[PDB]
Chain A
Amino acid sequence: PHSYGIRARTRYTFQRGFREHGQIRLSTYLKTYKVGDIVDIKVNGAVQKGMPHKYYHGKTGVVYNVTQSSVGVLIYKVVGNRYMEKRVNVRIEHVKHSKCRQDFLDRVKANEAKRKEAKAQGKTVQLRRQPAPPATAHFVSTENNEPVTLHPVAYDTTI
């Protein structure tokens, strides 16, 4: 009762979104990809050619090769006690950039700008992030906000 087809168990994985069928947006073809870019793999059901396997759907990798209409996303997959390098050739319709890399680039630019500014000002820079600190001490006031006493509510029929 088990089959090993390429698109087996992809009924909802490869489905287009609700009110999202029909024409494919053309900004995907205008996006530029380079070797070393970190991209996400999201299979588009309308583009049957260049389709990656269902395993790589939702994964993230690095492009090593760029062709006319496809990229070379590189993935690491567990096959037991080790990772193996998988080189998938995927059409750009199933490929989008990772917003984390754009956020990381902006963070690096901000860190360098702060570093130069602190060097000019001759003070500390504090370029390292920190986890959420414990809450400090405050002085919550009660004027016009007098506390209201609450009591548990008795059980009653609600039908």
Chain B
Amino acid sequence: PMKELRISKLVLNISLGESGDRLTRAAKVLEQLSGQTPVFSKARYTIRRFGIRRNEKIACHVTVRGPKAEEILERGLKVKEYELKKRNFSATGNFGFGIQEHIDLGIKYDPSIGIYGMDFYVVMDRPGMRVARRKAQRGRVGYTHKINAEDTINWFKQKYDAVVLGK
């Protein structure tokens, strides 16, 4: 009556690899899609071969939680036609994917602004995970209570009328 797997957070990213006007417009479309101000993902160091701007914005991401996150995930499954590969699900229970042309979601687009990709990541947890996240009396969650690949596969396949690949 307590082992109810539920969505904790969703991390959404853009796949462009470039900063500037493209990144600013990527941040704007992320804000429109999520309703929240982004955080510009930074580069921790510079590489001579690539010339990545050190300590400067390279990517953007937000984290959505609750019913709005579930609705966004449902929309992400709508474009993904509810088809996914078993490799997407890690041994820790997290699952994610990535689709280009985010125009497949519920938003109007134009070529002048540009086209940007969209990658979704979902962190799965069960009630009682606050033990490993609270400041005081922090502990380790039990092995049976931890999220595994088979558990998140069964949870995903139970609803959404979705299927996985036969790998």
Find out whether A and B make contact in their complex, taking CB atoms under 8 A apart as touching: no
Interface residues of A (CB under 8 A from B): none
